[PDB]
Assembly symmetry: D2
Amino acid sequence: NEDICFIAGIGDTNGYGWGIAKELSKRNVKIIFGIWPPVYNIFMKNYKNGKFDNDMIIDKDKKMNILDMLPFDASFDTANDIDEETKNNKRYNMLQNYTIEDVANLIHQKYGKINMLVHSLANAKEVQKDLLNTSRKGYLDALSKSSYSLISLCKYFVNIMKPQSSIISLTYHASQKVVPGYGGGMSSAKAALESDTRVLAYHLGRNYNIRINTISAGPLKSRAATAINTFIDYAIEYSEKYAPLRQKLLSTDIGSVASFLLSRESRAITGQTIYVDNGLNIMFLPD
Amino acid sequence: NEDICFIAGIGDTNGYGWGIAKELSKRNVKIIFGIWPPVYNIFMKNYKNGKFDNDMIIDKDKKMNILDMLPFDASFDTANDIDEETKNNKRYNMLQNYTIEDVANLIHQKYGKINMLVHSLANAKEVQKDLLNTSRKGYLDALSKSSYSLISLCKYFVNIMKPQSSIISLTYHASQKVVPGYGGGMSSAKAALESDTRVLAYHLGRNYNIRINTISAGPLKSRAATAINTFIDYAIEYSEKYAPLRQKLLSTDIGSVASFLLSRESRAITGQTIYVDNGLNIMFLPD
Amino acid sequence: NEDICFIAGIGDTNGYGWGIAKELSKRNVKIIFGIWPPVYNIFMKNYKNGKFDNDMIIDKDKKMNILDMLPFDASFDTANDIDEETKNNKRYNMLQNYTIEDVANLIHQKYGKINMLVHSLANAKEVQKDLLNTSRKGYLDALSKSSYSLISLCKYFVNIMKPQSSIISLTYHASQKVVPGYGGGMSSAKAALESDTRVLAYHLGRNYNIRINTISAGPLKSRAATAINTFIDYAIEYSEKYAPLRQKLLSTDIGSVASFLLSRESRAITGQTIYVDNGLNIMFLPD
Amino acid sequence: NEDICFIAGIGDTNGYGWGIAKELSKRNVKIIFGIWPPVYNIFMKNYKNGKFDNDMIIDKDKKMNILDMLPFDASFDTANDIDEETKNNKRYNMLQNYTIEDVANLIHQKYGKINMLVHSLANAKEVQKDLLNTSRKGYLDALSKSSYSLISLCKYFVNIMKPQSSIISLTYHASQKVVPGYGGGMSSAKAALESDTRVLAYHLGRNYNIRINTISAGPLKSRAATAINTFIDYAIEYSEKYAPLRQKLLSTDIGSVASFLLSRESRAITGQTIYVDNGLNIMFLPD
Ligand SMILES: NC(=O)c1ccc[n+]([C@@H]2O[C@H](COP(=O)([O-])OP(=O)(O)OC[C@H]3O[C@@H](n4cnc5c(N)ncnc54)[C@H](O)[C@@H]3O)[C@@H](O)[C@H]2O)c1
Ligand SMILES: NC(=O)c1ccc[n+]([C@@H]2O[C@H](COP(=O)([O-])OP(=O)(O)OC[C@H]3O[C@@H](n4cnc5c(N)ncnc54)[C@H](O)[C@@H]3O)[C@@H](O)[C@H]2O)c1
Ligand SMILES: NC(=O)c1ccc[n+]([C@@H]2O[C@H](COP(=O)([O-])OP(=O)(O)OC[C@H]3O[C@@H](n4cnc5c(N)ncnc54)[C@H](O)[C@@H]3O)[C@@H](O)[C@H]2O)c1
Ligand SMILES: NC(=O)c1ccc[n+]([C@@H]2O[C@H](COP(=O)([O-])OP(=O)(O)OC[C@H]3O[C@@H](n4cnc5c(N)ncnc54)[C@H](O)[C@@H]3O)[C@@H](O)[C@H]2O)c1
Ligand SMILES: O=Cc1ccc(Oc2ccccc2)c(O)c1
Ligand SMILES: O=Cc1ccc(Oc2ccccc2)c(O)c1
Ligand SMILES: O=Cc1ccc(Oc2ccccc2)c(O)c1
Ligand SMILES: O=Cc1ccc(Oc2ccccc2)c(O)c1
């Protein structure tokens, strides 16, 4: 009924960004994707070649309602931030207005004010290297894209939101307890994301009456998951064997939580980490 | 269709039990009230004389679908647990089948298996007495009636519940952080309840595919809350000034979260303490 | 000079009570044993016949400074709490002043005020029964003897303790995370104990300038531990393979931390759960 | 007895680095300071002009034993990392071998292997700006100097340590609960430090048998504390009024904890956050 959500960080339909997009369509929210420049063109190709038709079907006679699809790179806050190499690059040269600020500006100009923000991107150049052999550049690159991205997104997008808006992002338990293969300081990144959620909760709550929470999802065989080193195959088999609920976790599991988290229905919740993981986090010794 | 919920711990319309009842009605769920015999007769007259008429009111013209209302005492697991005095006591003499087991059976015989369970009750003889000054009897009292009852409610009610059912209870932050005024061992009962929710999610999740969670509610001006001597006004005045969301917290705010948690929509959440308190728990220092 | 410590919960030399006793001796602290009457006479013979001779041995030639050894039952707060059967029971008939209050007074009359208190005891009638299958009696039993005793030990022992004294107890991670095998409501008692340590730090810190903390010990092969049916071998084999510190965890490892926490050296620590388990709690997935 | 500790991040004697250095001298550990380049020369001047004589006195006839005092900038891992501006700068031109790697190399060459590491530096260019108006550069600068510094320090210094060595760093509660004035992403930085401690604990434990923990200190009117915006004056008055223990927290309070944390006496502790804050963290509602 004139609800519009922006989802940062889709590349295909095997991630949580898709799951979140499915479920929100059930509540008749219009969807706008933010797609990372280097995969935008291919994503666009697949969409037009119908690769995703099936994944867009919902309930009885309802389709997913994609208002727009835009290039978006969470590396850059303004135009002033893009370096000579990136600008010059084959992926980027063909596109424009993909910075955090340019995307707020562009959405707002095309469609007016929105009321739903989702952060659903992570990126860590050295993810495959354990924390101890992670370099300074790789650590900060991880923090920049995976965590600072959240603050920037909030900082530009509050302007174009209505009061009583909601914002989520996705996190992982590795921030609280040691996950051996989750390297490159994605642990570190997730650590800070959760803490920033509490801090943003305070500022966004008192100064605009906008809520923010994060969802701590169990494992899901996504594009990004397979970039780690298998690891994600072990995480899935372990989860389905030792979690208090022995069923397959689905992107739409997280999706529905996000939708309730994004609705008036959770008015009294903010600054929280909510686990959507079939209860895995509560276990100590595997039985 | 056929979503029946048993709510244990209703005494009036000023409580969280009522907020839950209301919000659950909006979803077209059938409700069954479980009412402590010390207040059961006075609840019935009040109701029959339509004194809750204005509080049964939902949305535009819609009323509350209360299926049945049953005397219920969370102290007694089965008919044999009942001591001679209580069976003979003025307010118990006239009443039948009010133990945890008889209530479970009666619900089954009368209505068949259900799919939702709310634990919404607490008791402590020595609530006015700070923990150090609490006698062994008072402690155990508080533990028995506020913490053990949930365990039992589970034991007897899994029998009459469908797989994929959901169970919630209510807790208070004092379990995690020091709150002067919350005595009797209540903080002890709360800690117990929150840890017991984890262990039960393991059992119920693996053994029956049933979910259990708890809601750490913020302050509400209920009958029970004024029994603390007032502590509650202070705690409300405090939440309304320092929380991120500076807005009155309503029984229905908790209600609608209970609705979510109790529905399929929370499929992948189990064993959790969900905070519904406008974010106060995340604060450290005031301003 | 004049550092006297009362240790509640000693039955043999295979326990944490003994590790604490040993390490405290190295600091030249005077020890007073509090021994459950069901094992008091058998402890005395064993001791007198010098069967603990090799376990009383510290460093190069130094022995254990055991000042006195007293029958003690954490079930009874005062002489009036004692039921006729127990007073008449074979193992209690011969013994005097073994309640929490008489023990406090006797210690004071015999030795004056002390400055250190160890709570090192636990009990649960139904430990073999998983939580869901625990009867109301067993639950309350476990809560009474493992959680309430600490509260009381405080109530009666603050009277005979100097300002700047310190009090510790022992807990187990199962309060925070699900550990199958830990039944009887023990996990409930542990959660209770950890929250009760916070509330008591408030009271004791403001009102008497006395410190209280708890140690979440890792697995140890003690008398009590084999009573769980074995659960303990599994848990040791597990800790030794997956913990960060792959090295046997010894009663004295906990002992020396108890020493630290009990000394002035921990002046600014109160209300905390300190983990001493080679770091196992921080793990999520095995390898 | 041939124990050597390295303390990164002293500038004067009002910080925790001094407190840690005092206490470790009581146990006859030789001390080596790491001093940030821009204050090295002045620090050195004061030392020689005797400004610190009084602050170096310990117990009866013992002085603080400062083995060496070296320039150290946690911004730079190797020689290859220092830029043309810094190299050219007035502070830096007069000094040499101040990178994390060069300091390990230099200590090791002069004095052989050490067994004690302390991390005791924080730095946030935008600390005075709340999280939401913190820029990308300021956020990452905070993370680089305050958190990544820990990993690098461990990464170079393991080489020059003995097995069974210990490492600490200092953190603040703001990582767990909202502290309004603690801006520029020092919250974020502290968040990640605590999470990295658990992760390093795992690698350093399994691969070298070296422990690591962090201490969460209450407020102390230090040089750096006064750089924030007062804020530290409020934090101190609040602490001494509402903490369970109403006494002044001293750098030597933290010091003694560090010393026990750094000794064989805590062999079974790793990967932990330990609160040294007079119990402040346990409170919810101020009484
Ligand atoms: N997949 C899991 O198993 C799992 C478990 C817990 C948490 N999470 C979290 O959920 C989020 C989504 O994960 P996913 O599995 O859906 O991965 P995904 O690959 O499906 O989605 C992440 C997307 O973010 C985009 N992206 C990367 N860098 C970017 C940048 N600099 N600017 C803009 N966009 C960028 C990529 O195009 C990628 O498609 C992640 O942040 C992850 O931390 C995932
Ligand atoms: N009031 C708050 O601010 C607050 C904050 C956090 C959590 N909670 C939780 O909410 C729950 C309900 O509290 P409330 O504030 O709505 O007060 P309430 O009076 O509505 O709830 C207590 C109700 O439980 C019933 N009851 C008491 N003992 C019983 C027994 N032995 N058997 C059956 N029923 C019994 C009484 O009829 C009473 O109506 C409590 O469990 C409390 O832990 C309340
Ligand atoms: N064993 C472990 O692996 C482990 C792990 C974490 C915590 N702990 C804690 O350590 C404590 C001691 O356990 P343990 O493993 O040394 O076994 P233990 O047998 O040494 O300790 C129990 C002792 O308490 C005494 N006791 C029992 N009931 C008593 C009562 N009513 N009054 C007075 N004394 C009584 C018994 O004499 C017995 O010796 C327990 O409280 C437990 O919670 C143990
Ligand atoms: N002071 C408090 O109230 C307080 C409370 C909790 C935690 N802490 C933590 O304790 C630590 C010490 O704090 P403090 O109050 O002693 O401050 P301090 O100023 O006494 O010590 C910090 C020192 O680190 C040095 N430093 C800064 N940037 C550096 C760099 N890039 N490379 C090398 N050295 C650098 C500075 O010279 C400074 O003297 C801090 O990390 C802080 O996060 C402090
Ligand atoms: O299930 C575990 C898991 C899988 C993928 C994740 O996202 C990443 C994005 C980029 C690099 C690394 C991970 C993640 O956060 C957790
Ligand atoms: O706002 C705090 C608060 C108020 C009332 C509560 O219910 C109780 C019912 C009986 C005894 C004690 C508490 C409670 O749990 C928390
Ligand atoms: O290693 C785990 C463990 C083993 C023994 C324990 O002591 C108990 C004493 C009596 C009843 C239950 C437990 C305990 O607390 C934890
Ligand atoms: O007591 C609070 C407090 C004071 C100072 C701190 O260190 C800082 C170092 C550099 C910039 C900002 C803070 C800190 O971490 C916490």
